Design a protein around this ligand. Structure first.
Ligand SMILES: O=C1NC[C@@H]2CN(c3ncc(-c4ccc5nc6n(c5n4)[C@@H]4CN(Cc5ccccc54)C6)cn3)CCN12
Lengths: 143, 130, 143
């Protein structure tokens, strides 16, 4: 077996106007020290980690406004109070004004320390999509 | 020491997403050889000559067929809407999953008619035991 | 633990009119042999690597034919193009200039040799976006 800290949390299809992460679901886990505290993954030990996250946005008809969709994975060091962007993307789904779909996939390898908190956050949770399993997730893998 | 797999799409097998190896590849699916944590990853590239009048949806999904629960369950999935000039749309999936010995894994798309076999190093699917 | 070569370099927000990669920054790294020489990642050993890169373009409106390119190339010790994308953000010209956003992600698995130099390059660095960290990056992961 592997003693490697790993985590794969999935979005709750019933957290009104927010992106709430869960481990107590099928095909989602927290293992070898990784904790999910206040919607954030707590790094159990210093090392290199693969951080990833995907969100799927969907909008029934192109809204009557230019819409900005952001997805950001942040790092809050043990002492820090707020985010420090690790990976971030911003997409404009609506050029003009049929349902649109926009997935955002962030991933990279980062050096993390003992007790750092990682958060995957979006600006528009009103456009999230949970109509199918495995479309919205956040995870980490120690190398 | 640790089971690994990296299969690529067959360019010469047009109209379907068929995987080719260099873990077993049985009936277009990766068979997990032992219980453990695995990194599952995949990428597909779509391409189309302009936009048709009938709306289009492009999906890519990695599924699991558990040794107790014989039904396909979604592990990772994404959906993109690409719509007289051509377009290109990649979809990439990856995550860490606890798998059991004998689990079948299948990366699948809905529209193989829009696949881009032209990009070799871009249509792939693999697993890495941690 | 992991002896596998990994790299995650980020664009310098200060560097005007160019896409300059940095490792000497917080939440950016070079590990297990990967070097950053003359804006290029030097592959330390033969093997299969995941090559990933993201750039974010932003422009204040659509004036009267923009082409935005992003390309990853390998220079052997034999110059080759690995991944490339070209986007036209203004597929309609604003006749109130609303800002457009165009992210380009390139990624693939490639067999590389020891001493290969990898470069992630764009044609229009005047449209780059440095409003927040984590938006522009280039990295490799040995498999
Ligand atoms: O603990 C250990 N030890 C062994 C294993 C190695 N290792 C590892 N291997 C392969 C890959 C990879 C290979 C091919 C992909 N194709 C995509 N991915 C792959 N990961 C995703 C998802 N997507 C984009 C992307 C971008 C950046 C990072 C990820 C990814 C497509 C990522 N990590 C680091 C962790 N490990």
């Amino acid at each position: 077996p592997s003693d490697k800290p790993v985590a794969h949390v999935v979005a709750n299809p019933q957290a009104e106007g927010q992106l709430q992460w869960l481990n107590r679901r099928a095909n989602a886990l927290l293992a070898n020290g990784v904790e999910l505290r206040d919607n954030q993954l707590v790094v159990p030990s210093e090392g290199l980690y693969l951080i990833y996250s995907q969100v799927l946005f969907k909008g029934q008809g192109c809204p009557s406004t230019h819409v900005l969709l952001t997805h950001t994975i942040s790092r809050i060091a043990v002492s820090y109070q707020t985010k420090v962007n690790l990976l971030s993307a911003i997409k404009s789904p609506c050029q003009r004004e049929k349902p649109w779909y926009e997935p955002i996939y962030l991933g990279g390898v980062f050096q993390l320390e003992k007790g750092d908190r990682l958060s995957a956050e979006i600006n528009r949770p009103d456009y999230l999509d949970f109509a199918e399993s495995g479309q919205v997730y956040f995870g980490i893998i120690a190398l």
